[PDB]
Every structure is written in structure tokens, then in C-alpha cells.
């Protein structure tokens, strides 16, 4: 599993590293994300 560098406040790469979480290998579905977000972006409307 790959690692990713951790950045200090100044910008220097710290010695520590974390392994990339499995979620970053999840499928990328621009068709699904729009279908969900179309309805979820509707759930704060006020009636008129």
C-alpha cells in the first residue's frame, strides 16, 4: 500500500507517513454522484 507525505506548517515534509485509505480506490461514478446530489440538494428547500 502506498504512502502519502505529511506536511508541516512551514511546508517541510515530515518524517511520518500514512497509508492511503481504501476509500481512495473506490469507484468514481459521475453519473451516480449527480443523481444523489440532485435529490440531496433538494432537501433544504422551503415551501411556497
Amino acid at each position: 500500500r502506498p504512502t502519502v507525505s505529511i506536511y508541516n506548517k512551514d511546508g517541510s515534509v515530515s518524517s511520518e507517513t500514512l497509508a492511503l485509505p481504501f476509500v481512495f480506490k473506490a469507484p468514481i461514478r459521475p453519473d451516480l454522484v449527480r443523481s444523489v446530489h440532485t435529490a440531496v440538494a433538494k432537501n433544504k428547500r422551503q415551501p411556497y
Partner: protein, 52 residues
């Protein structure tokens, strides 16, 4: 790791949740077409845009 989990191990912060497994294993079709295992069996290619 616990907010989302893994495709084979349940997430800790979401119950009975495993990540969605990909429909396709490898996401490189253009490499799949241009790989040996297919290029060895594929019959001879036709021509490109064909003369009138």
C-alpha cells in the same frame, strides 16, 4: 479507515458497511486492447479510412 472502511472489511463507524466493489477490475481498457493477451489472438486488422 473507520469512517469508510474497506471493500472486504466492515467500517467501524458505519455498521455493516463495506465499500462498493468496482464493476471492472482494471480501469485501463486502452491498455487491455493493446496488451499481448489480446493482441496475440486478434485477427489481422482491417485498413483505416478506405480509398474511394
Amino acid at each position: 479507515d473507520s469512517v469508510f472502511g474497506s471493500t472486504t472489511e466492515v467500517a467501524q463507524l458505519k455498521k455493516n458497511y463495506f465499500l462498493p466493489e468496482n464493476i471492472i477490475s482494471n480501469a485501463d481498457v486502452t491498455r487491455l486492447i493493446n496488451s499481448d493477451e489480446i493482441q496475440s489472438i486478434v485477427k489481422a486488422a482491417g485498413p483505416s479510412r478506405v480509398k474511394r
